[PDB]
Amino acid sequence: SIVNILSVNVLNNPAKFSDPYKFEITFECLEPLKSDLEWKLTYVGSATSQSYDQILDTLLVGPIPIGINKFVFEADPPNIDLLPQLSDVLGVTVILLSCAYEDNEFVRVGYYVNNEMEGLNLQEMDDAEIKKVKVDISKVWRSILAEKPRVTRFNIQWDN
Amino acid sequence: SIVNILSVNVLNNPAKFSDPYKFEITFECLEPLKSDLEWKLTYVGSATSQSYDQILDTLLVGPIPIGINKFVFEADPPNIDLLPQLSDVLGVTVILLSCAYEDNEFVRVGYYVNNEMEGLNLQEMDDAEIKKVKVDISKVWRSILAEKPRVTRFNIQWDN
Amino acid sequence: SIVNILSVNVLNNPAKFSDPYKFEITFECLEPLKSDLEWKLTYVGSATSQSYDQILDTLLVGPIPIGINKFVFEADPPNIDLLPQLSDVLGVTVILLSCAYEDNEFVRVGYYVNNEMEGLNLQEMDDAEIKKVKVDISKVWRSILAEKPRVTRFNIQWDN
Amino acid sequence: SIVNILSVNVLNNPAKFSDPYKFEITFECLEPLKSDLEWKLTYVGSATSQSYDQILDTLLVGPIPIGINKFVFEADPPNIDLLPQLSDVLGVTVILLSCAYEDNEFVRVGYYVNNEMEGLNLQEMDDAEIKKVKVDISKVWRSILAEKPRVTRFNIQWDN
Amino acid sequence: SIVNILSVNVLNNPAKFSDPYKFEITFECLEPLKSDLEWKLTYVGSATSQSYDQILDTLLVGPIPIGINKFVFEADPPNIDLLPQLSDVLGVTVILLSCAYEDNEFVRVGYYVNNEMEGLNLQEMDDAEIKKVKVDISKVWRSILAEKPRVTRFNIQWDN
Amino acid sequence: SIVNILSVNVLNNPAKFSDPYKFEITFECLEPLKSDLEWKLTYVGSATSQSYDQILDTLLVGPIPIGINKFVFEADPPNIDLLPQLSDVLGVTVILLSCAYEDNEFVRVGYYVNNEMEGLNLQEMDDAEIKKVKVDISKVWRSILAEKPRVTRFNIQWDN
Amino acid sequence: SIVNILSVNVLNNPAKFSDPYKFEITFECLEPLKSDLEWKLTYVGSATSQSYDQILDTLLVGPIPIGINKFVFEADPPNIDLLPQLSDVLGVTVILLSCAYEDNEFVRVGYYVNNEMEGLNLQEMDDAEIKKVKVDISKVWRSILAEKPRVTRFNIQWDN
Amino acid sequence: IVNILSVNVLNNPAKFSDPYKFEITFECLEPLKSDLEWKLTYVGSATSQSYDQILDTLLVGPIPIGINKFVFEADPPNIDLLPQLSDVLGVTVILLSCAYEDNEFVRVGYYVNNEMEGLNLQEMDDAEIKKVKVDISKVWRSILAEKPRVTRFNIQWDN
Amino acid sequence: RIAPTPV
Amino acid sequence: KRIAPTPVYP
Amino acid sequence: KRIAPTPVYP
Amino acid sequence: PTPVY
Amino acid sequence: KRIAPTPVYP
Amino acid sequence: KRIAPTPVYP
Amino acid sequence: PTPVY
Amino acid sequence: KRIAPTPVYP
Amino acid sequence: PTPVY
Amino acid sequence: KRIAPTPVYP
Amino acid sequence: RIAPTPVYP
């Protein structure tokens, strides 16, 4: 792995469910790459079913000079109408930040994201009582657990 | 040292500025103890001054069994009036989780805490424009950075 | 992989820009090998283009005993005429120490290198002002940041 | 402890023997301290005898707010005339960067420093032949091994 | 403005790099003048820096008659030693024809200048390979693009 | 006139109202300026009053070497909430491309822009019927008349 | 030549690919004419072959007063089925506005026409990639570059 | 129907005997049936046409509608075909023309200035110039590409 | 077919 | 205010 | 000798 | 400042 | 959408 | 936000 | 037909 | 000789 | 206390 | 180094 | 080209 992510820093935390995600991402690269880095953020809408994944945004970053570089990835919030249920926004959910070179994924950082609603004590409620909640999305805030990323790395064939 | 904190956990995160703090604290106790543990949580109103501290609440915990134990410590929110300036609530601020034995502080865990207001983009503002912001406190949410505690220890005479 | 670089020490540090590089390299060899190790050192002329790479020197090391071995790699300095501009020598630049087996690169250690000019305060200066410097190369000294190797391994078919 | 050094970064490296030292030092403090931090830099003139120690400069830093702060410590170079012998400047020597609270030392970071002279191959020479070298101090450069600090910590009584 | 350049004409084009510059300059003068015109020709050694400028020669012109007048301005060639890199003479470079009145620049005419070496095909080379070219200066010829002057004007106090 | 704009070319035309503006600007400069060029793009929200002007984006370009250079200026689209009425996007509006040096504007390029909505025949309507138009902004396209720029120049102190 | 086009203004610009072309043509007539002017508009389907030419519409203008006259030419859009491929609509294509007198072409005004598709960034793409586009023609907008007519006159025997 | 928008001399100055490399850009609105016929002629006597040298020819096609360009690399003049060798020196002319179906429609003449190493042509009159012992490998040219004289001719195109 | 309106 | 803690095993 | 023109625009 | 084509 | 990275070091 | 210019000529 | 630069 | 710290966080 | 890069 | 300029008519 | 100096324990 010729590209190493050094830090990802979430610039706006906590934020409204509906605010754009802003990540300042610093990476190191040894050789100057021919192509862009294709980054992407993915909201995981159902823990069980991949078909509720929302690709929130993507971003090409380039050209890539040797050394340590950073950039801000501003991505759109999830679309509330694509969730299986509205109440699924609450509690812990996941986002996956990833990067690909020439349409091949080389790293993926997963974040747990905690979501709470104004005036609602979520820790007492059991899963049945949670769904009955009348979710007002304009009153849901997130905090990304940026300090505890789960990194997965993939071997790809770079500019060889 | 007889008692050592193993883990603290923020139950309600993010939260409104005005929400009470809920902490699940787990700790070890090597020999049994005559007196109670005295817990306390403090909101740091000012970086330069200790006199804007607000002892949010206190909790006596006891009797102390040897081993590994846990309790919930619920603390009142800060009082906005006792702040030097209204805009101080915004950005990163600090809280101090502390425990004493027989009126002597033995451990002090500091946390940094992010504070954001709905509709306000703090990141792109400079300090002087932040001062101008008309803070509506019912629109401010905190996220305690519970994964980066700053522990300080103090030597005390326990049961001797 | 049959060969692994244990350590590399820079002998003449700091040194003049035009002084040869002298590295003491210690490596481990698991099985025996028939051919030699092909060492190489490359001065990186441009962050944005590999075309300004100067292969400073190469060195054949062999026959490779098994176990734990060291040698000295002495390599010519960069040729100042081959730079995109004379001022690019200043500040932090890169070099790439590399090894191959039968023309196949199996390991590449990159180092950052500070470069300062007598009488010149680089910190007080901005890009524009640096480019405007009248570089006297004979008054330029480097320091290789040897404690921070950037390692990259590659899979090769050794004696197989 | 109450004050933790997080990073020290040598801004001007390598540098002429006679250039001022410039350190950018970043530290963290939980409680707001009543007094300044007294910083001090010390050139170690003889490894054996402490009486050749040159306190190059000192610097009071304050007042100290809670949180992470940094500063630049610019100190004067060693005085050549206070060394036992001129040729002592060559090879590896030491500086001690240290900090005190109310005249009590709580941390001390030691750095090895490597010193070379234009056109002189120091690595070949044995200790007798080194002294014979006619040291031109205007042609001696240093490189501080800032990546390999030796930290020492001392228990002091802070504002208790 | 009292003096205005009407035409400049390069007498010796193409020319060897080393050949002196021969300019036939024609200009208008609206009212008569107490002092001499001070002409000057500068070779631009560096695109990014003004400190590789070479004031090739100067010429006093006077006394100035009202009307349309003309003179020949012969200037020494550039000195190859004062170039940053030897290969800088090749390709497009710049010269600045300038006129002042009583030590104040009132006009500056810039010209781009093509430079080619016998046997070298510069158009199919990249910059990096150009740097490798062993320049033989006595085989380099220039063509000043005398039909595309880049004129800058300055306001001055003439005989007020 | 130390910097002159030779061409500005709108890369994406026509374009959605809310797509960013992408300008390829080419300029010429004969001295290596000390400072960056400060570029700005302003959407004129009311042709009558300046209070609805929106500074869409800004971009520093430097350092500036001698020669003909170019860059791409990608600016954010206008904010529709800031317009007096929603129907003002339609028909001809204006944008201003300007560049300052050291906070002094030296050139301003105004452009007419024509704005049309899908399904709507603006030509046959008079102001009264246009105000009635229920604007769907995602159906509004622009075309900048990049062929007819009105250029305004201002005298400034440069590095003189 | 008794008739000369003074100006042509495109009323609906930008427009949808499938929106009719609306031109306001203003022309000068010297002597009187007996027959009408035969206007035509042609969408050029292929750079390499006149066979994909689509005659969009024709219009008879008459009787021709003498002096200075205007009218509106409204012409059907291109038929997408007649293209060599659906992707040829994208980028810059040509249209030919033309006039004749008793079936004799006396004037032919060519215009380049930009064509963009919602969501598609044509500048980042190459030919291969463009051809591969799944064109939704209903999301394609054009902008006619009306400030850059390419006129071609022809000699015809008018009323002689 | 075909308009030249720019011609750009890629290698200038150059050795007398280096080939001419012109990057020519033109515009055309119809897809012509035939090739464009390009030609570069060295004028060896300004007085008499019998010393003209067609240096090279190039067909360019097929021609699509649009603005296109190409490089014309033409052989250098043959020195054995000049009336005298000293004629290479000073200002001579080349003509760049295009024809369509063997009918010239455009002609671009250019003045070219020729100088020899070590020799100061400006201080000499024609007599002393003839006397010049010309070393051709020491003669360089510069084409005044900025001052073309363009001549146009009416032709039948695909009508 | 239509007629032009003069100017 | 005062309470007792719940023990935690193993 | 012969060649395709290279398109500049479009 | 017209575009090039 | 596409942006150049900002360099941090060097 | 800040970018270096791209050389066109020379 | 002048060159471009 | 005394100076004030530059803050970093907060 | 190592520098950040 | 000095020179007188030659005049030019008509 | 050279031969490496060997190193133990």
UniProtKB/Swiss-Prot annotation, chain H:
Chief location category: nucleus
Localization terms from the record: Nucleus
GO CC term (a single one): chromatin
Record has Nucleus as a keyword: yes
Domain of life assignment: Eukaryota
GO molecular function: H3-H4 histone complex chaperone activity; histone binding; histone chaperone activity
Disulphide bridges: none
GO biological process, one term: chromatin organization
Keywords recorded for this protein, A-Z: Chaperone, Chromatin regulator, Coiled coil, Nucleus, Transcription, Transcription regulation
Whole-protein coverage range: 3 to 161 of 262
The protein's name: Histone chaperone cia1
Gene behind the chain: cia1
Function: Histone chaperone that facilitates histone deposition and histone exchange and removal during nucleosome assembly and disassembly.
Cell inner membrane among keywords: no
Organism: Schizosaccharomyces pombe (strain 972 / ATCC 24843) (Fission yeast)
Family the UniProt entry places it in: Belongs to the ASF1 family.
Subunit-level organization: Interacts with histone H3 and histone H4.
From Swiss-Prot, chain S:
Family listed: Belongs to the WD repeat HIR1 family.
Identification of the protein by name: Chromatin assembly factor 1 subunit B
Coiled-coil zones: none
Native organism: Schizosaccharomyces pombe (strain 972 / ATCC 24843) (Fission yeast)
Purpose of the protein: Acts as a component of the histone chaperone complex chromatin assembly factor 1 (CAF-1), which assembles histone octamers onto DNA during replication and repair. CAF-1 performs the first step of the nucleosome assembly process, bringing newly synthesized histones H3 and H4 to replicating DNA; histones H2A/H2B can bind to this chromatin precursor subsequent to DNA replication to complete the histone octamer. Plays a role in the maintenance of heterochromatin.
Deleted gene: phenotype: Viable vegetative cells but sporulation is inhibited.
Binding partners and assembly: Component of chromatin assembly factor 1 (CAF-1), composed of pcf1, pcf2 and pcf3. Interacts with pcn1/PCNA during S-phase. Interacts with swi6 at the G1/S-phase transition and early S-phase, but not in the G2 phase. The CAF-1 complex interacts with histone H3-H4 dimers.
From-to range in the entire protein, with total length: 504 to 512 of 512
Compartment(s) of residence: Cytoplasm; Nucleus
Disulfide bonds: none
Highest taxon in the source lineage: Eukaryota
